[PDB]
Design a protein around this ligand. Structure first.
Ligand SMILES: C[C@@]12CCCO[C@H]1[C@]1(COC(N)=N1)c1cc(-c3cccnc3F)ccc1O2
Ligand code: NI
Length: 393
């Protein structure tokens, strides 16, 4: 899959994007790769943060679906007009497909100044698509219209400008050059988000000793569209307490632990060893088994070059509190080659050939761990009448 290696780019903290073409003749656009959403949506009107947008009028193959879409979320919203057109990935499979495209006509706090992307490729399942699950997501269309296997994999590699990032999205397979050691699989619990189950959390070898349902309250997901490792409130508090304790020789402001303030050391003197490793044990394919993925401070402390002190190495704490469950974001994913094996309803992890580490410690994927009479660690989200009233024909 040499053609697909190194096809992702971006700016630190602002998402990874892949080059895509839309329409006939092909219009090139940079598209955010988001395993936490399910719409293909592209800027389709002028915006201050867009250098370019999808021009429906220039495409002979564009078809209007005569239906709008409105997508509010926590920070803001995007909206626009649904249609279809021909889509390809120049540094992807040698195929062209007709996909749904949401042409974004108005948005608030969606595009990011300087991120260099103009659209989003939602790689999650139909269940969370907008306006509803009958709007076929891009990957579903790709699989149905071509002979591309139902699997993709992601290798995310982590003074005036933000640091550039790179990576690979391999569509249709697994590229063995992108990982080392064993590839371990955890079940996709349900096909909506890429939902998984965490059965144990350790911070420098020490068990947090919480009821494991707390780790997955109210879900745990693998999400390329979130920068941070996000943890449920109770888990976040317990983790921060443990990381604080391990690093106690350094007294950081409260701002740092809230992710609102950088901490610096003189260039190349960062005391990595005072910061603990974090292990998440994921449910194995075998009932009573688990495997652990272990990340370093190199993953959870994000580099940000401060203009005022460009001679310092400065870091943001990239673990944050959630009210919507665990989010294994770029912080987690940058340690690993991550295989989204939709065909077999499972997610694979292996140590990334590009992960950042030091001479003492490495990101690791290790197993099996077996537990006698393993409890159910999954949480069942309370069913609303709204959700229950939906017919799924
Ligand atoms: C797609 C949605 C709209 C619908 C709700 O979800 C949104 C979200 C948030 O989490 C995920 N996974 N996608 C999302 C993330 C980023 C982003 C911002 C910074 C870095 N990386 C990014 F993906 C930008 C836009 C955006 O919009
Ligand atoms: Ni009905």
């Amino acid at each position: 899959f040499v053609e697909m290696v190194d096809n992702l780019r971006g700016k630190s903290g602002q998402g990874y994007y892949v080059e895509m073409t839309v329409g006939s003749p092909p219009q090139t656009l940079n598209i955010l790769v988001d395993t936490g959403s399910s719409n293909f949506a592209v800027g389709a009107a002028p915006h201050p943060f867009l250098h370019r947008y999808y021009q429906r009028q220039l495409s002979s193959t564009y078809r209007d679906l005569r239906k709008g879409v409105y997508v509010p979320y926590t920070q803001g919203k995007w909206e626009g007009e649904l249609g279809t057109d021909l889509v390809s990935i120049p540094h992807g499979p040698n195929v062209t497909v007709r996909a749904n495209i949401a042409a974004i006509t108005e948005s608030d706090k969606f595009f990011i100044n300087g991120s260099n992307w103009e659209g989003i490729l939602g790689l999650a399942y139909a269940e969370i698509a907008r306006p509803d699950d009958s709007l076929e997501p891009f990957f579903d269309s790709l699989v149905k219209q071509t002979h591309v296997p139902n699997l993709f994999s992601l290798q995310l590699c982590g003074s005036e400008v933000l640091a550039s990032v790179g990576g690979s999205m391999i569509i249709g397979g697994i590229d063995h050059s992108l990982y080392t050691g064993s590839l371990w699989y955890t079940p996709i619990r349900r096909e909506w988000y890429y939902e998984v189950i965490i059965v144990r959390v350790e911070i420098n070898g020490q068990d947090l000793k919480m009821d494991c349902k707390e780790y997955n309250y109210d879900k745990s997901i693998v999400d390329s569209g979130t920068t941070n490792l996000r943890l449920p409130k109770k888990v976040f508090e317990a983790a921060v307490k443990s990381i604080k304790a391990a690093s106690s020789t350094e007294k950081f402001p409260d701002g740092f632990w809230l992710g609102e303030q950088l901490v610096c050391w003189q260039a190349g003197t960062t005391p990595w060893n005072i910061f603990p490793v974090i292990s998440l044990y994921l449910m194995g394919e075998v009932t009573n088994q688990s495997f652990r993925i272990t990340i370093l401070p190199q993953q959870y402390l994000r580099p940000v070059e401060d203009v005022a002190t460009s001679q310092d190495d400065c870091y943001k704490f990239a673990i944050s509190q959630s009210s919507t469950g665990t989010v294994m974001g770029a912080v987690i994913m940058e340690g690993f080659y991550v295989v989204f094996d939709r065909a077999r309803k499972r997610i694979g992890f292996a140590v990334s050939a590009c992960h950042v580490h030091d001479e003492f410690r490495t990101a690791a994927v290790e197993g099996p761990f077996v537990t006698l009479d393993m409890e159910d660690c999954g949480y069942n989200i309370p069913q609303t009448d709204e959700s229950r009233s939906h017919h799924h024909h």
